[PDB]
Amino acid sequence: GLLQMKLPESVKLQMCNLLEYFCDQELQHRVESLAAFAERYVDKLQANQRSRTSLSSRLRSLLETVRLSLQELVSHMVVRWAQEDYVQSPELVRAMFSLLHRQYDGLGELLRALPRAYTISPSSVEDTMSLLECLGQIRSLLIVQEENLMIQSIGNIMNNKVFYQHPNLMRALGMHETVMEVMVNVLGPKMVTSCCRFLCYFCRISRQNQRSMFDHLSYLLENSGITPLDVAAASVIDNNELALALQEQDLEKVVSYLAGCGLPCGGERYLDFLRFAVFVNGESVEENANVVVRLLIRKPEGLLAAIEEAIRIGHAIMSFYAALIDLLGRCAEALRIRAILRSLLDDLVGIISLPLQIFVPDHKASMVLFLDRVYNQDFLLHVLVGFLPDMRAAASLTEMALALNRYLCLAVLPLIPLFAGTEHRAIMVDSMLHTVRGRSLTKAQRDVIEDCLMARPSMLQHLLRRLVF
Amino acid sequence: RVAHALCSHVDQAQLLHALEDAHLPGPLRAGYYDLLISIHLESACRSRRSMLSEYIVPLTPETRAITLFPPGLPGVGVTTSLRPPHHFSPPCFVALSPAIPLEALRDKALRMLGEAVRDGGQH
Amino acid sequence: GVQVETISPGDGRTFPKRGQTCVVHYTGMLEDGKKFDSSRDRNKPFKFMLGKQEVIRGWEEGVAQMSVGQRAKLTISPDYAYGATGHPGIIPPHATLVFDVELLKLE
Amino acid sequence: SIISLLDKHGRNHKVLDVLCSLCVCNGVAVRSNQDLITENLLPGRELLLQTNLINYVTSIRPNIFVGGKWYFEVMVDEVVPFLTAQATHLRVGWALTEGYSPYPGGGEGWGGNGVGDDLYSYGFDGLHLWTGHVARPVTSPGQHLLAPEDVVSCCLDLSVPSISFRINGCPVQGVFEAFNLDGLFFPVVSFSAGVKVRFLLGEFKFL
Amino acid sequence: PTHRACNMFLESYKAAWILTEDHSFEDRMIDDLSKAKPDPLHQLVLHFSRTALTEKSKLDEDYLYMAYADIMAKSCEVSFEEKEMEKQRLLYQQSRLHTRGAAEMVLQMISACKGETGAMVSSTLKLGISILNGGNAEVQQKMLDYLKDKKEVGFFQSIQALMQTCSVLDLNAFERQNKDDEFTQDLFRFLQLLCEGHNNDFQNYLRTQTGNTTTINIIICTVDYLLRLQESISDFYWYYSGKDVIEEQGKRNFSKAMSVAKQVFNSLTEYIQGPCTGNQQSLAHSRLWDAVVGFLHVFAHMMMKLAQDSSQIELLKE
Questions:
Q1: Which of E9, E51, E71 faces A41 most closely, judged by CB atoms?
Q2: Do the annotations mark residue E196 as ligand-binding?
Q3: I need a labelling partner for E114 at 20 to 30 A (CA). Which of A54, A254, B121, E167 fits?
Q4: Structural domain boundaries of chain C?
Q5: Is B8 at the interface with chain C, CB within 8 A?
Q6: Do D28 and A143 touch (CB under 8 A)?
Q7: Among candidates A54, A39, A224, A193, which has minimal Cα distance to A122?
Q8: Strands, E, within chain C: which ranges?
Q9: Domain spanning C1-107 has what CATH number?
């Protein structure tokens, strides 16, 4: 024999490693037999599934068998190594007992082993394997020309259809964590950005992953002090359920990043996150939004002058004050502080700036939503001046022609004297003529029937006379 | 690309001759071996550690009926899982991942094992 | 420029032509005469299409001179080889290459 | 500058430990600087020690040393040129007992025959010669290497070392001249691999 | 769904139906490490100890160590004499590691934990619980000796920053959780285990840390933990009291906070429980009495709020 034969230690290392291959293989084959047991079991399950529990006893017969001279002589020989020596070389020993533990609880070892195990369809194997090789490329890059290969990986992975087809695999791979580690490593270089947009799109696909990266996001934000932030919002917006779970500290760090910026685009991005941080799929949660709102005022401490000087013409700080309004707009005992928004009507006349406005769409898209969330039919007659841009509507037939389809939404938003109303109603009848994307135009038809519900009525019947034409 | 350079400069076959004799001094040998790994084997394995760790599997017909237990052996050639093949283009000095002999080599090393065991047991 | 010289004469007839995949043994050494390659080191013959520009230019010129079964010493100029760039990690810049080629068969 | 330091200091192992330290970080590495190490080393050949291998070389001589003109015959019964990685050795030439003491276990730049200033030699492609193991490539009248055919033959005039090899009745041009007669001269035939050669002496052919 | 489903079979199989019974192995494993100068298990121990001694500023998760800490973790007149034989069987299970000097190392790792809140730390602490239970004073004294011979400073700091932080149920968390405190429990139970068997020398040494040039009173800090958890309790009152009935998960979770907090109070009880007059001085300087008031308050009302229903008293009991 060989193993039984005594030799000095340093061989012992290698030898036990040689053995680790064995145990590893046993674990592998075990997973595999488990899978065959799976495919064999699913049959009758689909039978009862279409038949619309007692059988289960038979699997019990094979269930206990799964648990397990071979492993025994290994454990024993390890003990012999540890007996007659007082060995040192901690590394050696570490391996030793690693193996030994691999011997004494292959059950639980199997358990920790399972997650990374995953079945795949035989048709799809080719693309998967290649993806594994590219993943192995990135893992080759784990230890690091710098700026291109990684991107090769990136592109290569986006090309894969498996990335849609097996999201659970992609979560199982844990690769997100890897590539993110690369990111951090860089952050301690231009390529970084596409890579980041990669990890972002990766995050996008599923909640069972969006969770995961959501767990990383503070860590990502320490990094976002330097666009990772995009990744963060991608990790948050789709799922309210962990949007609830977000730490305040994320946000304090976000505002902390809002400090000497104002001596900006990075500041408008910080705003963009917190814009995405609450409003979510539906109505912004009162949870997060409250904790946001508590701190909003704290870091800023004639802004309309900065606004209109900007409208007239650098292009950064203006869109900071423009995004900030939408930010304060989407957020909302809560009746106590929700009134403070309006104090810090904090805009008020700034609403009327929107009328002066006609770069541009950010300004309407921010302030209209600021207005609908906090704010009188006659006061609407005061508002009658978004109609400026309805005058601009025919000019499409530039940074403008294509802009109408998002203004198609912005017109619909404020559903919530008289001859002036005949006029801006006739602008809307011009939008009916535009009806004479397109389903959003049907929502504009809903804005029309809602304009009929809203409301001298007879001047509306005059705009309905031009509309009778 | 560096490794290819070394293949130019140390020669796999040279090391293959370096596998044989005891007369070759210890550490230097250790270098020739570690390099023999290094020049070639090391990368494939480098990836392979993780890949084999992954334990992912398909549904090829063997896999649905691979079975297992006797009323036990390990190094079966079934299994598969996945795990990518390692490519190796030979270092052809003409205009990555250098080639080495495969089965030849395992035969060599295995021969070294037998040589290691038949005298190592006698001590 | 190139100065290839024949070693063992072959059939003396069928020189390599366009598109042919030449099958040859050889070794590569420097102006120093230090080796940096050998087909025998891998034991496996090396095979290359002609005119594919897959080779150093001097190999493209000189091997065409070779007949079937022929052995030939190649004195290829660096300008026809890796040249002033050199071969990264292998061949130093402005080094004439010296080969001991032996064609087995045109393919 | 560091490699250059090593070249300044000759063979100091410490510098190399420095180099491997340069190569690699805490785990990661700067591949580029390493490739620079290689281009600055491996092409440079000369600074780092370097290695290869030959096949065993074995010279043969007739028993009698010479100190008139003499002539001898060496038929080539066999050549196996490319067995193993090395091209088969089979140099042939004159020599003397002090500047040529062929120990097979190495010495001189990769060989045994043709290496000495005291030895004078012949073989392979283009015929020609080796002194100092220098390959002066004097072209043959026409041509061929060494294969199991040629009756290669040699002569040497007394006093004057006007050696000139002959390829099977065809002399290999003008060759050696003017050398010391320090000790007796004798004929030599080195070889390698599975090779045989016959002496038509006691049987003359070409004189 | 076919293969899509098959993974679902994997994970289903993974669950409780396969979280098997076979866990008698550890003990015979532990004997196997101690068959046989030094013992193999002891070699494990000095191994991990070596793993501990080295600087890492933070620490390696080292799954291996937490694992063996788990392995060693496996060691658990009818009410007396049978309790006695079991008690001493446990004393053998504890002594068996006690020979190893394990405590040392565990304390070392724990000292190394510094500001960490890692899972492996839990494994360690749980190991400490595995050894210290049953009031093993001998372990406490050999530990203490290691605490004075080494005068580590940082161990107590390690406990302190943790204790300073640890975990608390708070409030908003639940508010969001509509649609680890257990570690704290475990930690401070551990701390109670430092003091059981009433080693007042050790308790005072925790109070003042005389071997070290530095000084710390851990217990002050656990009081403070009791404070903050109490303040959680209180806000739990000022929320829930207006709604009378409590739901379900808040109930059981808050109950588990009461297990924690109870455990804290218990730990204090051990802290003072002997004739430690100086610790009582410390509590003379402690803010402890408010700490009592607030429980008095919240319970004085909440128990009434829970008395509304018999479904509610399975909590009121707590």
A1: E9
A2: yes
A3: A254
A4: 1-107
A5: yes
A6: yes
A7: A39
A8: 5-6, 21-25, 27-29, 35-38, 46-49, 71-76, 97-105
A9: 3.10.50.40
